[PDB]
Amino acid sequence: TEQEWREKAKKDLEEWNQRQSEQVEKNKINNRIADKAFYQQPDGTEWEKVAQLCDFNPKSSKQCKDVSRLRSVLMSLKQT
Amino acid sequence: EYDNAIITMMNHPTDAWKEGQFKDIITKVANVELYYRAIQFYLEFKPLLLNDLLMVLSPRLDHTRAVNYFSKVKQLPLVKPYLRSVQNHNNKSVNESLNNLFITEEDYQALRTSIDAYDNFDNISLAQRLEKHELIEFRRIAAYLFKGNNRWKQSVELCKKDSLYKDAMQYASESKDTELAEELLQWFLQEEKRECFGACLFTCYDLLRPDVVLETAWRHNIMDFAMPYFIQVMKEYLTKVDKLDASESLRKEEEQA
């Protein structure tokens, strides 16, 4: 029965499309709340802000010019 | 009987057809379009039983027309396992198909890893899609492929557009090149995101000359996140003059001999 087989092919296609749309909606609302997180942010209290708004990254990638003082400012001034 | 087998399988869609029986005689079939007819007739009746033929039709396959017809039937998400099988080839068609799978998929992480492993495509259109793909991460990868395309100053410029929340700095880091960060960072100072401008300048500190820094510090009469950078200036300069005095001592002492 070619007709019923085509019907079942369309059925499988629709059953696949509905789960596709469902998963698109799911990841979409996931990205919505993730963007709300991307929208929940600003742009001692001065140190609280140098941490909050744009916090630097004290990594081991300081190979540029041997900048050490970042070691101190993190505890002397910045984020202190 | 092999030709007879494919006939008696395909000849009677009404009463005499069978999905599985075809997986054996394929070994001696010269042409490849016969397997295309097989998979097409399967899609016509039993699209769920394709995966088998996909597993078996792996070595001898003209994947070009395969993925073409899969796009025609638009069972690309159904032929997806075959796509996982053949994507290791880094071919234009398979790469673009997976990229569309990611676009409609709204996926970026696996999309990231894929466009890292495979590259047989352009950056322009991909940037177009990702920049408008609803996620700071999507447009972030749109920008990433700019250096992926080896054209900077537009990516970090896009960070300047929207991703300002330390992400502007996030790509100021990778910008890694001079004669931009001066004016970009000054414009950055125009708005009072300077709060962390010590980092905003350090993220590309390699080739900064502090003289303009002192100038602009004077221009706004601004010292915060510069007083630290001032300590930087003098301490690097401290070390510099120190090693200089050292080397000089060495030279003048060795001059005697």
Numbering used by the authors:
A (entry chain N): 124 to 166, 189 to 225
B (entry chain K): 1370 to 1626
Question: Paper's wording?
Answer:
The most abundant clathrin adaptor is the 300-kDa heterotetrameric adaptor protein 2 (AP2) complex, consisting of α, β2, μ2, and σ2 subunits. AP2 plays a central role in CME through binding plasma membrane phosphatidylinositol 4,5-bisphosphate [PtdIns(4,5)P2], the two most common cargo motifs (YxxΦ and [ED]xxxL[LI]), clathrin, and other regulatory/accessory proteins [reviewed in (1)]. Here, we used cryo–electron microscopy, tomography, and subtomogram averaging to determine structures, interactions, and arrangements of clathrin and AP2 at the key steps of coat assembly, from AP2 in solution to membrane-assembled clathrin-coated vesicles (CCVs).
We determined the structure of clathrin above AP2 in both the YxxΦ and YxxΦ/[ED]xxxL[LI] cargo–containing liposomes by subtomogram averaging: The structures were the same and thus were combined for further analysis. The resolution is lower toward the NTDs of CHC that extend downward toward the membrane, reflecting mobility of these domains, but is sufficient to position the full NTD. Our structures are generally consistent with those previously described from purified clathrin in solution in the absence of membranes, but by now resolving the NTDs, we were able to derive the positions of peptide-binding sites within the clathrin cage. Between the clathrin NTDs and the undersides of the triskelia, we observed a “bean-shaped” density that is not part of clathrin. β2 appendages link CHC repeat 1 in one clathrin molecule, CHC repeat 2 in a second clathrin molecule (both in the ankle region), and the NTD of a third clathrin molecule. Another motif-binding site, recognized by regulatory/accessory proteins including Eps15, is located on the β2 appendage sandwich domain close to the point of interaction with CHC repeat 2. We now see that auxilin would occupy a cavity bounded by the β2 appendage, an NTD, and clathrin ankles.
